[PDB]
């Protein structure tokens, strides 16, 4: 059985007051840590103070990382520096970085590989646009995942997040439609990586979800958790994290 | 023009080295009236750096996005920076223009937005090895004109002229060619912005500045400070930051 995983991507948001409020809120919600692996991904400048202030049962992750050792890359986050401060997770390949900053498949794979070597869990993000949904959903996620497979041998500390990029515009993606893609991701992992990798690999839904319908999403057969966007800034996040009780 | 010294830590650091780098700067005696000193740590250290480094030293981000808070995973927000007391940012560093393909226009746009939200911006400009052949002034003027297209008020801009071929290579420009590029930058600003704005505009030299070549620059009247890279992580930065006051 794959452990339920809930990540909260705060994106480019935050003030000192709102980060304190979110963190003190997570510190007081009743977590069954054996039931859920919970991680928050705050805007870069808050990474260290978030790790200091949020309780040990909640992981902290970066929203992006570069693919090289410490060096002359102004503006970037270092995988070495992150884990030296207790930041043990990172996103790679978020659709906003693929689309706005044109991060390539290979660059996302290279960042993933380096972050894994340096000791982080990587939430590697994938997903197709509306134009790609027309006929090429499977081919797009397969291409995105293949690029990571080319560089990464050990998947025990990857979790894949599927973003229905086509729906950020489109309407709301339904749980059915998520299940479809998730099943395809699990087929791909079985064929490329082996059944025992595919059966342990968390595939979390990255499209819009709230605490009321996330139960409807986990009713479907290949959805292991969520990468929550805007709800992760709100009290609603605690009802997604805590859904099993 | 108040002399300006910035220390760009780039993509370096650990808890332990950041602590002692800052400790070193705290116990360094400064003439704040004479030198505006700013350090730009790696993103994750931005708040702890502002908490630990004395008030006389400013803290800056190494980059910022050009929009209000929103769905730009992985970016630094100018509004969030100001809210936490981080009052400076770099824009247009050569490593971002080259590795991440930041265009003149994007750099100008994030400069304008950072300025609107309260930051002082150190906008970086500079020519490559190939461009040094015959095209130095063409390049830096194009890069400046893009900023001028977007920005009306230059009082909280500092210009950092950093020849790409001088970045981390040990090949410092000699002060004599640094002077003449800066003189051209000041002639460009005089024409575009007026003599009054040009005379107030800090133009600082970056690229392999270190504790040993810095004094030579101080003889030159259009070099208004330094942007220091590798050396800002080292104790000799304690010189560079005070050397104008000596």
Swiss-Prot record, chain B:
Cross-referenced InterPro entries: Aldolase_TIM, TIM_sf, TrioseP_Isoase_bac/euk, Triosephosphate_isomerase, Triosephosphate_isomerase_AS
Q: Name one Pfam family in it.
A: TIM
What pathway is this protein said to act in by its record?
Carbohydrate biosynthesis; gluconeogenesis; Carbohydrate degradation; glycolysis; D-glyceraldehyde 3-phosphate from glycerone phosphate: step 1/1
The positions flagged as active site in the entry are 93, 162
* Catalysis performed (reactions): D-glyceraldehyde 3-phosphate = dihydroxyacetone phosphate
Q: What is its EC number?
A: 5.3.1.1
| Gene3D superfamilies in UniProt | Aldolase class I (3.20.20.70)
Q: Which GO terms describe its molecular function?
A: triose-phosphate isomerase activity
Superkingdom of this entry's organism?
Eukaryota
Annotated residues that bind substrate are located at 8, 10
Would you kindly state one Gene Ontology biological process term found in this protein's UniProt entry?
glyceraldehyde-3-phosphate biosynthetic process
Which SUPFAM superfamilies does this one have? Triosephosphate isomerase (TIM)
Q: Which UniProt keywords apply?
A: Gluconeogenesis, Glycolysis, Isomerase, Phosphoprotein
- Phosphoserine: residues carrying this PTM: 103, 196
GO CC term (a single one): cytosol
Could you give the subunit structure recorded for this chain? Homodimer.
Instruction: Name the protein family.
Output: Belongs to the triosephosphate isomerase family.
Q: PANTHER family, per this entry? A: TRIOSEPHOSPHATE ISOMERASE (PTHR21139:SF41)
The name this protein goes by in its record: Triosephosphate isomerase
The record lists the organism as: Schizosaccharomyces pombe (strain 972 / ATCC 24843)
Gene designation per UniProt: tpi1
